[PDB]
């Protein structure tokens, strides 16, 4: 049956037909919702043809050539591939658009009006962790190009038996350290002490300070991980300052400008790409809420409401609510006055309305994430806060996978 | 279906169980293939036939008997009993007054959108089934909203109407909150008032009511006793407790003419007691700051005066990167829990709300086994993630008793 999805401030009503493509589950059912769950819970020959038919199938009707000559060899060309050698390999179109649709099929995301352009960096001849730095590099220095950020995916060789995978075990490319002091304390990200450590533990030497970019750590074939340091100029980060607050800068923080999820799993047509950094620009909130102001991570609210001299001692003051504002306020300055590419929750989420209105005409939906896509801070002045969003999963997809140092059998 | 389900929060890595859910009676709109938990709303001539009430019957007063320490004994099944021959010889039954109060404290535990239930077992229960008139509706109801206010220090209270019966006998208030201000579309097509209440205005102006045409005009009563045509009643304004809203630091934020009312009452929901349908059973708490700050104050469909802030404010507002939307936002909600406070009239700041129900969740996960959520409206309207719920994993099903909706009484309501 077709859904409706209504906007409570504007009033629009858009109707959902695209839900009906999906086959596989949320998590809920009829008595049990569990929409806010952020986790909720190898293949063969047999499972593995309908799944590669079925992507065919769209890849074929989405260049307006269903059922064409190209289209029926092609089926034929991969029944007896995978039958044969219990695998396939994708053309290079079809794992064009295969990555270009996981991102356009990525519920939680709201920056999915750029999805068409993406750049598609085809890895799959890589055999050894230097040639994945080797490949990670030009990524992070193609998607950087120097503050005018693109766009970028990196794909690399599929899963195959489970025992040769290719991982990334940095969570994102770029990201800072954190080390648990003697004291009990922690300095730089809390959130990386555990990564931190196994790159310690492998042979990194830390400087030991607030910001350290970590090393790569990367396994090819299933082998042991390598680390390697990514080359500082290939790194562009942003002394935050506020434009008002003069004293802001001598607070002394930085973000780098390049996000780059390096540990999900890539799915098209059944065959699972474990190994597939990829890279966008920043909304201001994931490092002015989360990244500084969350109480697990840089927790910088009272440091800052200290040199606001705001009164601290009641909550009911929103003390932390307009330290918060400035904070967010000097991320967005920071990035533009250096021209990095940033966008501010107000234009990413009015955007992402009219992606939604876009995908709603020519597809018949759009796959959506409330409890993701609203942002951290403000949420009912933007304006998804008042959009009804239908979540469903579509394929090709972004899936989650276990951390490899759970599961890696060392040597 | 899993016997035991795992909510982690992310913040403070603590993990919960629930085996509560098991108990879930009616559905969410979910289905194994789609989440509808953002959508708002996932015929009342139909009422319950005697067949599907025993069994809803008993499952609450089991469930009643149980929470005494007393299943199973003779009490419990002497009530089975009688209630059976109720439905048998009348195809309905009444509630005792101790199962009443327990039914409605209960919807209340169960609401999973609220995010005050810390307070659930401290509610007042008024028992309004001998109501006959609308006269008798309007004098219960201002007993309810005089009780309730004491003067500032809120009590959370509930008046409980006459069931439904055939459904052509329906008790309703028409109003969806006892205290709401009017709206007055102009022929410019700009609105005076609240936006929001317009179409509800033009009904009460349309039955009767004299408007002011003013910017804050309390909308009168609108009340249907015993399914017949709806009457008007005017609120006593000394009833009505309200607060001007001004600004510890913007000397000029008292001259915005701002000011809202202290009593936040739900009239327009169904309580749902063991298949009994209570139709009109208007509830009442506090509020929440962001209820009045951010949704009342600065939705652009409401009254929509971030933009008069920001100017006051001399804010940069040409590019949206300045964050002024956010700035205004954050003074105007620091200005109303400022006039509240001021005035001693009960209001809780969404800091210590969500704080208090961070704990009150945990209780029961611990002495109940679960604890149902709807993180879509626990997070509040703004700051959300600098709030304990944003990082707490939530489960959300529907247990009786429950507060439900229900069709709003002008598109049903059959004119004499
Ligand atoms: C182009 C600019 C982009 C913006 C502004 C943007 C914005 C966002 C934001 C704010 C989130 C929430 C992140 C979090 O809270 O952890 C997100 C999630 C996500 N994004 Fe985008 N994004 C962009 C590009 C991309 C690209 C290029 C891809 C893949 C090709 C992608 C795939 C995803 C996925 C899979 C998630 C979910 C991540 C998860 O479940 O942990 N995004 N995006
Ligand atoms: C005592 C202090 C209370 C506080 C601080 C509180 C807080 C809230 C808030 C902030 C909401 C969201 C409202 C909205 O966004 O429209 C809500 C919803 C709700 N509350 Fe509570 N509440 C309180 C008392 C009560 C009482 C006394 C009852 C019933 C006996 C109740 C039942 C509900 C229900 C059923 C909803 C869902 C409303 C809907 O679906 O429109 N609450 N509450
Ligand atoms: C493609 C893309 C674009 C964009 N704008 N954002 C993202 C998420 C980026 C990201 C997420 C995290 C999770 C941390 N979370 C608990 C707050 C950590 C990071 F270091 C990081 F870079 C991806
Ligand atoms: C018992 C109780 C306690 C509490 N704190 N809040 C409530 C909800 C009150 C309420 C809701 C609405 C819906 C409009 N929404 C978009 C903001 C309008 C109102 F006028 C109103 F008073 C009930
Ligand atoms: C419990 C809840 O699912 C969790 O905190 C989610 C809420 N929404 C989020 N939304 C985004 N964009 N990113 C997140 O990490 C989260 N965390
Ligand atoms: C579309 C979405 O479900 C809608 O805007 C919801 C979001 N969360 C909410 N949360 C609360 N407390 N109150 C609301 O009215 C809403 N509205
Ligand atoms: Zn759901």
Same mark, same amino acid.
């Given at each position: 049956?077709?859904?409706?999805?209504?906007?409570?401030?504007?009033?629009?009503?858009?109707?959902?037909?695209?839900?009906?493509?999906?086959?596989?589950?949320?998590?809920?059912?009829?008595?049990?919702?569990?929409?806010?769950?952020?986790?909720?819970?190898?293949?063969?020959? $047999?499972? @593995?043809?309908? @799944?590669?038919? !079925?992507?065919?199938? =769209?890849?074929?009707? +989405?260049?307006?050539?269903?059922?064409?000559?190209?289209?029926?060899?092609?089926?034929?060309?991969?029944?007896?591939?995978?039958? /044969?050698?219990?695998?396939?390999?994708?053309?290079?179109?079809?794992?064009?658009?295969?990555?270009?649709?996981?991102?356009?099929?990525?519920?939680?995301?709201?920056?999915?009006?750029?999805?068409?352009?993406?750049?598609?960096?085809?890895?799959? $001849?890589?055999?050894?962790?230097?040639? *994945?730095?080797?490949?990670?590099?030009?990524?992070?220095?193609?998607?950087?190009?120097?503050?005018?950020?693109? +766009?970028?995916?990196?794909?690399?060789?599929?899963? /195959?038996?489970?025992?040769? $995978?290719?991982?990334?075990?940095?969570?994102? @490319?770029?990201?800072?350290?954190?080390?648990? =002091?003697?004291?009990?304390?922690?300095?730089?990200?809390?959130?990386?002490?555990?990564?931190?450590?196994?790159?310690?533990?492998?042979?990194?030497?830390?400087?030991?300070?607030?910001?350290?970019?970590?090393?790569?750590?990367?396994?090819?074939?299933?082998?042991?991980?390598?680390?390697?340091?990514?080359?500082? !100029?290939?790194?562009?980060?942003?002394?935050?300052?506020?434009?008002?607050? &003069?004293?802001?800068?001598?607070?002394?923080?930085?973000?780098?400008?390049?996000?780059?999820?390096?540990?999900?799993?890539? &799915?098209?047509?059944?065959?699972?790409?474990?190994?597939?950094?990829?890279?966008?620009?920043? *909304?201001?909130? &994931?490092?002015?809420?989360?990244?500084?102001?969350?109480?697990?991570?840089?927790?910088?609210?009272?440091?800052?409401?200290?040199?606001?001299?705001?009164?601290?001692?009641?909550?009911?003051?929103?003390?932390?609510?307009?330290?918060?504002?400035?904070?967010?306020?000097?991320?967005?300055?920071?990035? =533009?006055?250096?021209?990095?590419?940033?966008?501010?929750?107000?234009?990413?989420?009015?955007?992402?309305?009219?992606? *939604?209105?876009? &995908?709603?005409?020519?597809?018949?939906?759009?796959?959506?994430?409330?409890?993701?896509?609203?942002?951290?801070?403000?949420?009912?002045?933007?304006?998804?806060?008042?959009?009804?969003?239908?979540?469903?999963?579509?394929?090709?997809?972004?899936?989650?996978?276990?951390?490899?140092?759970?599961?890696?059998?060392?040597?």
């Amino acid at each position: 049956r077709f859904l409706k999805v209504k906007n409570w401030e504007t009033e629009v009503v858009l109707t959902d037909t695209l839900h009906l493509k999906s086959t596989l589950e949320t998590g809920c059912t009829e008595y049990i919702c569990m929409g806010s769950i952020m986790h909720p819970s190898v293949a063969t020959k $047999d499972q @593995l043809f309908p @799944l590669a038919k !079925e992507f065919i199938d =769209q890849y074929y009707s +989405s260049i307006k050539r269903f059922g064409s000559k190209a289209h029926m060899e092609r089926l034929e060309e991969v029944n007896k591939e995978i039958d /044969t050698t219990s695998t396939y390999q994708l053309k290079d179109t079809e794992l064009i658009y295969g990555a270009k649709h996981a991102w356009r099929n990525a519920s939680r995301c709201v920056g999915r009006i750029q999805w068409s352009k993406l750049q598609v960096f085809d890895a799959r $001849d890589c055999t050894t962790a230097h040639g *994945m730095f080797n490949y990670i590099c030009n990524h992070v220095k193609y998607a950087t190009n120097k503050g005018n950020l693109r +766009s970028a995916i990196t794909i690399f060789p599929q899963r /195959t038996d489970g025992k040769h $995978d290719f991982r990334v075990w940095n969570s994102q @490319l770029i990201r800072y350290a954190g080390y648990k =002091q003697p004291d009990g304390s922690t300095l730089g990200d809390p959130a990386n002490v555990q990564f931190t450590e196994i790159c310690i533990q492998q042979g990194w030497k830390p400087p030991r300070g607030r910001f350290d970019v970590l090393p790569l750590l990367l396994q090819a074939n299933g082998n042991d991980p390598e680390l390697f340091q990514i080359p500082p !100029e290939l790194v562009l980060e942003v002394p935050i300052r506020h434009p008002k607050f &003069e004293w802001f800068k001598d607070l002394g923080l930085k973000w780098y400008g390049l996000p780059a999820v390096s540990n999900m799993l890539l &799915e098209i047509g059944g065959l699972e790409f474990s190994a597939c950094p990829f890279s966008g620009w920043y *909304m201001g909130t &994931e490092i002015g809420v989360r990244d500084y102001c969350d109480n697990s991570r840089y927790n910088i609210l009272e440091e800052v409401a200290k040199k606001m001299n705001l009164d601290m001692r009641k909550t009911s003051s929103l003390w932390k609510d307009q330290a918060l504002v400035e904070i967010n306020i000097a991320v967005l300055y920071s990035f =533009q006055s250096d021209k990095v590419t940033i966008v501010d929750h107000h234009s990413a989420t009015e955007s992402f309305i009219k992606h *939604m209105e876009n &995908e709603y005409r020519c597809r018949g939906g759009c796959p959506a994430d409330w409890v993701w896509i609203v942002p951290p801070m403000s949420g009912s002045i933007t304006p998804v806060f008042h959009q009804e969003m239908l979540n469903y999963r579509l394929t090709p997809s972004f899936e989650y996978q276990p951390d490899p140092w759970n599961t890696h059998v060392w040597k």
